[PDB]
């Protein structure tokens, strides 16, 4: 899939109408879709560029349109050879959501004095 974090951004945009059983579930859905932009934003931030501007521009186009952080030029991620195995992207997302889900609910904590 397109690298540079664009695959997850395209996926997130396709899920804009996804809803759950209640408002709290809807917030959870939004939390996840928002986190899906984080990878592209951090890549840009590490470049010394502005995350929101680049994110906004990538979301503006579609398909394999993305930001090439090496050359700091927009273009077709596939044509520029910036690809990620679908397997690593999928795994990164599932393990992140898995541990995040666990953490979320902590009623009480117990530890050694």
State the binding site. 4, 68-70, 84
Helix (H) or strand (E) holding 47: helix 38-47
24-83: contacts with its own copies (CB under 8 A): 24, 46-48, 50, 52-53, 56
d(CA 26, CA 95): 21
Nearest distance in Å: CB 9, its own copies:
15
Numbered residues of the known binding site for ATP: 4, 68-70, 84
For binding to its own copies (CB under 8 A), which residues are involved?
24, 46-48, 50, 52-53, 56, 102, 105-113
């Amino acid at each position: 899939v397109a690298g540079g974090g664009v695959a997850l951004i395209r996926v997130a945009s396709k899920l804009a109408d996804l809803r759950g059983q209640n408002e709290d579930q809807n917030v959870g859905i939004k939390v996840a879709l928002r986190a899906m932009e984080a990878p592209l934003r951090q890549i840009v931030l590490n470049c010394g560029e502005e995350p929101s501007v680049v994110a906004n521009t990538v979301k503006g186009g579609d398909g394999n349109y993305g930001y090439n952080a090496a050359t700091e030029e927009y273009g077709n991620m596939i044509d520029m050879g910036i690809l990620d195995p679908t397997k690593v992207t999928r795994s990164a997302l599932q393990y992140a959501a898995s541990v995040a889900g666990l953490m979320i609910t902590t009623e009480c904590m117990v530890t050694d004095l």
